[PDB]
């Protein structure tokens, strides 16, 4: 009956065992993101999804279930991607970035405290709710059913984790890994490139291990010491020493008044144009 309820309009994303479609509800004409997941932990997470409510997390509107799939009728977010919307601003400050990160931290803290790990947190996952200038930023794809293609069986049979035993020191998803990812996104939000952007893949591995991050001139010249301090606490190499979302939310750059109001759009926008593949 899923085709009796919804008109399928386009594919918005696809992963190993889950995909998201733009759909129109036939009865009402309203648009939604339908996340289709190929079949205890998933059912327990759905139970939690049903109960939780956060202004920065896509709403679960309904669930349909077949013998082979769950169909999660989700809120559609139509405001565009984080970095596209920064390019369209014309003016941009540290406090603008801090306000986005505060929202992301709040969302991910709420997931974490309800036993959900976000997984593979990428800039593309962070979408504005509406076209309006003051729009909330939204987390969209997250949790057990995150669309990623991990290991050599992801596409073939929809099964993640086929990775040679010497490769992974630990299971690749955790609350601390989500926090590190938020550190990286913060870094790029303030300069327009990821840390160690110009290092080879092999050197990047070593640099990340070493954990001594750099804030190069001229790009970081007019950025606050507070911002750099905040970022370093999330990029911290030791996951036991790394800030949790809770601890990050209490840092002066987020919670206080250390975030600057200087226009950094000129440099950040040039770097986004230079460095983002889709520019």
């Amino acid at each position: 009956n899923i085709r009796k309820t919804f008109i399928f309009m386009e594919v918005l994303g696809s992963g190993a065992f889950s995909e998201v479609f733009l759909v129109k509800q036939r009865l009402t004409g309203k648009l939604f993101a339908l996340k289709c997941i190929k079949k205890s932990s998933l059912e327990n997470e759905i139970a939690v999804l049903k109960k939780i409510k956060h202004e920065n997390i896509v709403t679960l509107e309904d669930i349909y279930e077949s013998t082979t799939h769950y169909y999660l009728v989700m809120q559609l977010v139509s405001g565009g991607e984080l970095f596209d919307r920064i390019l369209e601003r014309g003016v941009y400050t540290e406090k603008d970035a801090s306000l986005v990160i505060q929202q992301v931290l709040s969302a991910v803290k709420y997931l974490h405290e309800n036993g959900i790990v976000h997984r593979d947190l990428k800039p593309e996952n962070l979408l504005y709710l509406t076209p309006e200038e003051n729009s909330k930023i939204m987390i969209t794809d997250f949790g057990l059913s995150k669309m990623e293609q991990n290991g050599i069986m992801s596409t073939a049979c929809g099964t993640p984790g086929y990775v040679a035993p010497e490769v992974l020191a630990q299971k690749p998803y955790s609350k601390a890994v989500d926090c590190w990812s938020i550190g990286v996104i913060t870094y790029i939000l303030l300069c327009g490139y990821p840390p160690f952007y110009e290092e080879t893949e092999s050197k990047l591995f070593e640099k990340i291990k070493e954990g001594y991050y750099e804030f190069e001139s001229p790009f970081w010249d007019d950025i606050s010491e507070s911002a750099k301090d905040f970022i370093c606490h999330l990029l911290e190499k030791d996951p036991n020493e790394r800030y949790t979302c809770e601890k990050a939310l209490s840092h002066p750059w987020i919670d206080g008044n250390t975030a600057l109001h200087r226009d950094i759009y000129p440099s950040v926008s040039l770097q986004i144009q230079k460095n983002f593949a889709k520019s």
Binding site: N1, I2, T5, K50, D62, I63, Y64, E65, S66, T67, Y71
Partner: peptide, 6 residues
């Protein structure tokens, strides 16, 4: 072929 939750 679906059951609607709730």
């Amino acid at each position: 072929g679906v059951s609607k939750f709730a």
